[PDB]
Design an enzyme around this catalytic site. Structure first.
Site, PDB file in Angstrom:
ATOM      1  N   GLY A  45      -6.765   1.585   7.174  1.00 25.62           N
ATOM      2  CA  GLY A  45      -7.223   0.897   5.688  1.00 25.62           C
ATOM      3  C   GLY A  45      -5.855   0.597   5.073  1.00 25.62           C
ATOM      4  N   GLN A  50      -0.411  -1.826  -1.761  1.00 28.03           N
ATOM      5  CA  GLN A  50       0.501  -0.919  -0.815  1.00 28.03           C
ATOM      6  C   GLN A  50       1.557  -2.013  -0.187  1.00 28.03           C
ATOM      7  OE1 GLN A  50      -3.201   0.879   1.235  1.00 28.03           O
ATOM      8  NE2 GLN A  50      -1.600   2.350   1.383  1.00 28.03           N
ATOM      9  N   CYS A  95      -2.805   8.462   4.026  1.00 26.72           N
ATOM     10  CA  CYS A  95      -2.428   7.233   3.375  1.00 26.72           C
ATOM     11  C   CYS A  95      -1.253   6.647   3.766  1.00 26.72           C
ATOM     12  CB  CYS A  95      -2.300   7.446   1.625  1.00 26.72           C
ATOM     13  SG  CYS A  95      -2.334   5.832   0.940  1.00 26.72           S
ATOM     14  N   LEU A  96      -1.078   5.314   4.110  1.00 26.89           N
ATOM     15  CA  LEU A  96       0.321   4.766   4.629  1.00 26.89           C
ATOM     16  C   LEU A  96       1.438   4.960   3.467  1.00 26.89           C
ATOM     17  CD1 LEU A  96      -0.946   1.767   6.622  1.00 26.89           C
ATOM     18  CD2 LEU A  96      -0.048   3.951   7.447  1.00 26.89           C
ATOM     19  N   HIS A 137     -11.511   4.961  -1.131  1.00 26.24           N
ATOM     20  CA  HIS A 137     -10.100   5.446  -1.020  1.00 26.24           C
ATOM     21  C   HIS A 137      -9.157   3.837  -1.432  1.00 26.24           C
ATOM     22  CE1 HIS A 137      -6.294   7.217   1.031  1.00 26.24           C
ATOM     23  NE2 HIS A 137      -6.123   5.845   0.919  1.00 26.24           N
ATOM     24  N   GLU A 138      -9.510   2.779  -0.457  1.00 25.26           N
ATOM     25  CA  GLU A 138      -8.798   1.610  -0.434  1.00 25.26           C
ATOM     26  C   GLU A 138      -9.020   0.866  -2.085  1.00 25.26           C
ATOM     27  OE1 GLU A 138      -6.533   0.805   0.895  1.00 25.26           O
ATOM     28  OE2 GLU A 138      -7.156   2.345   2.438  1.00 25.26           O
ATOM     29  N   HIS A 141      -6.916   2.076  -4.632  1.00 25.29           N
ATOM     30  CA  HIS A 141      -5.706   1.502  -5.017  1.00 25.29           C
ATOM     31  C   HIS A 141      -5.871   0.472  -5.899  1.00 25.29           C
ATOM     32  CE1 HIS A 141      -3.052   3.709  -1.942  1.00 25.29           C
ATOM     33  NE2 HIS A 141      -4.030   3.603  -1.181  1.00 25.29           N
TER      34      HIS A 141
END
Ligand SMILES: O=C(/C=C/c1ccc(O)c(O)c1)NCCc1ccc(O)cc1
Ligand SMILES: [Co+2]
Length: 166
Positions: A45, A50, A95-96, A137-138, A141
């Protein structure tokens, strides 16, 4: 092209992204760069901030049976909005933008969302389990929320420990 991924504790990740209004070739290339960037860093994701784009759009591509990702299943959701949420569950997340740290977070176990694809077409999607988690989650962001923000008092200390650990 590959884009630089923003990592915690960058204040850029606290940005509130804005609605996408023009679904053009510029927007499509951004989405393509996001997919290339996500796969390159082996993520499932990725949200626009990000990579520094304060736009309310994110992509999700969960691996299937074989355990591999097929671009065919990649979800591109823009201007998402929750229509309904239900249940509750604990899911360990990563998470990235917060590499190396994984922790359980409380999420709705089921959600129905409304959004638009890259062609501005309106879509309605119901999800559960992993897909419902990635969506929540996304979307967090888009509102400047990281999963480490939702950690319990105890697991919050665990983060600070493992953080100073690196
Ligand atoms: O794609 C990622 C994370 C990738 C990652 C790759 C390498 C690392 O070292 C790392 O710490 C994280 N997250 C997508 C959002 C997401 C998180 C949890 C979940 O259950 C469902 C969806
Ligand atoms: Co994330």
């Amino acid at each position: 092209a590959l884009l630089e991924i923003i990592h915690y504790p960058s204040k850029i990740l606290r940005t509130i992204s804005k609605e996408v209004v023009s679904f053009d070739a510029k927007l499509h290339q951004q989405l393509d760069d996001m997919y290339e960037t996500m796969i390159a860093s082996e993520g499932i994701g990725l949200a626009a901030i990000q990579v520094g784009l304060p736009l309310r759009m994110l992509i999700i591509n969960l691996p299937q049976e074989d355990g591999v990702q097929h671009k065919e299943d990649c979800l591109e959701i823009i201007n998402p909005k929750f229509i309904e949420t239900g249940g509750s569950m604990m899911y360990k997340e990563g998470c990235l933008s917060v590499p190396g740290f994984y922790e359980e977070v409380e999420r709705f176990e089921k959600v129905k969302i409304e959004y638009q694809n890259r062609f501005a077409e309106v879509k309605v999607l119901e999800a559960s389990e992993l897909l419902a988690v990635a969506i929540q989650h996304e979307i967090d962001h888009l509102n400047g929320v990281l999963f480490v923000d939702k950690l319990s008092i105890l697991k919050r200390k665990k983060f600070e420990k493992e953080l100073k650990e690196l």
